[PDB]
């Protein structure tokens, strides 16, 4: 049982390295026949803050790359939204910018968000200026994180969980 359950939405195309952000989450454990054949699109973990037990449940929602119109599936029903672009890929940044502009338009101010610039591999070429992404992030008033180093990803989740807890 938990004091809180915080729902996180992980938004990102294929090939931007979303797996990288999910290493401190685990799959739930099933006997259910139908689930055991296919799996699920969310992962879980438990943390403790201020004496309170909090489940974090993160959805990397199956099929999301196919439906990129911004609907209430993207802007409602999550405590936190994590949007991931690939630093080696200008069109990736351009798409996420757009998605986040639209999410900003329709979401509650009460939803925590995070822009993540990921770079999966040591050896591809960087092309997205972090000043520009940071300038964009500041404009919507949301944190920005550049990731490769697993450490700062954990800090980001922890800060987001802390901020969600203050508003709930």
């Amino acid at each position: 049982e938990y004091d809180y359950l915080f729902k996180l939405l992980l938004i990102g195309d294929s090939g931007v390295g979303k797996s990288c952000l999910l290493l401190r989450f685990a799959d739930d454990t099933y006997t259910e026949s139908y689930i055991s054949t296919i799996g699920v699109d969310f992962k879980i973990r438990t943390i403790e803050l201020d004496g309170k037990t909090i489940k974090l449940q993160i959805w990397d929602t199956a099929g999301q790359e196919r439906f990129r119109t911004i609907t209430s599936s993207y802007y409602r029903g999550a405590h936190g939204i994590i949007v991931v672009y690939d630093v080696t890929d200008q069109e990736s940044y351009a798409n996420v910018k757009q998605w986040l502009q639209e999410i900003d338009r329709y979401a509650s101010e009460n939803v925590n968000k995070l822009l993540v610039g990921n770079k999966s591999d040591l050896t591809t070429k960087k092309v997205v200026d972090n000043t520009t992404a940071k300038e964009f992030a500041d404009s919507l008033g949301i944190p920005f994180l550049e990731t490769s180093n697993a450490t700062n990803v954990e800090q980001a989740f922890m800060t987001m969980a802390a901020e969600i807890k203050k508003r709930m």
């Binding site: 809180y4 359950l5 699920v40 029903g77």
Partner: peptide, 30 residues
């Protein structure tokens, strides 16, 4: 997709958050 996305999330509550989200998510993955 929209309905399943929404339902998997809504079904995750402090009462339970495993079986009903799982089932709905497994449909969506399929």
């Amino acid at each position: 997709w929209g309905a399943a996305s929404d339902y998997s999330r809504a079904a995750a509550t402090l009462t339970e958050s495993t079986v009903e989200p799982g089932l709905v998510s497994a449909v969506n993955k399929m």
